[PDB]
């Protein structure tokens, strides 16, 4: 997010339409369904909770 913000600011100040770089990849040229077209970015975003949060319990029980 920080890198995209800085890049878009720099591109806008330079006189061009800014672009957004997606984590996972770009779109697929298909004509069936919207999920398949943007499968890579959706696949990256669907792992948000497992990627960040720990598997073990955060607090302590029984003590």
């Amino acid at each position: 997010s920080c890198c995209n913000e800085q890049g878009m600011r720099r591109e806008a100040l330079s006189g061009k339409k800014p672009n957004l770089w997606l984590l996972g990849g770009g779109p697929r040229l298909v004509n069936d369904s919207w999920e398949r077209m943007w499968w890579n970015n959706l696949h990256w975003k669907r792992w948000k909770v497992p990627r960040t949060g720990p598997a073990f319990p955060q607090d302590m029980y029984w003590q």
Binding site: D59, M60, Y61
Partner: protein, 167 residues
Amino acid sequence: GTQQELAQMEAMELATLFDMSKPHPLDNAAPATPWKGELRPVPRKIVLSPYQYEMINYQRMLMRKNIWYYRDRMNVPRGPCPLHVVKEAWVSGIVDENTLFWGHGLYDWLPAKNIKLLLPMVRTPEVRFATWIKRTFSLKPSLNRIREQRKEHRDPQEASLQVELMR
């Protein structure tokens, strides 16, 4: 004679005492002592019973896997927040005890200090030291500078949120 009449009148008053639409003569009455702005005395000695210990342990068991959410000034939910993300946001001065949070065990959005066990989890000694440093050396001088630079911040009406960030 008079006792029975007084008892009946008191029963009638009890009948409509909590009818908030009915005005009552004891409303806005003169207190026994002149009114002065007081504050609740801070407790000193606290002795917890085993009942409270076990209740706290049970509540910690229920909330040990929670993921929290909070709301910003524009009334938009903000980010999937595990415990360490909440701690980092608290240290950075983005959220405080008045922010609206939601977790698994609640039905509505409540202020952070009104959730049962959310402040003890965040406030580790390192978090306290870091938030004190951030409040004292980064946010306060910046607030002073922005107040001095722009006149749109009216001097008579100035917020005091930075002063109480450490808590």
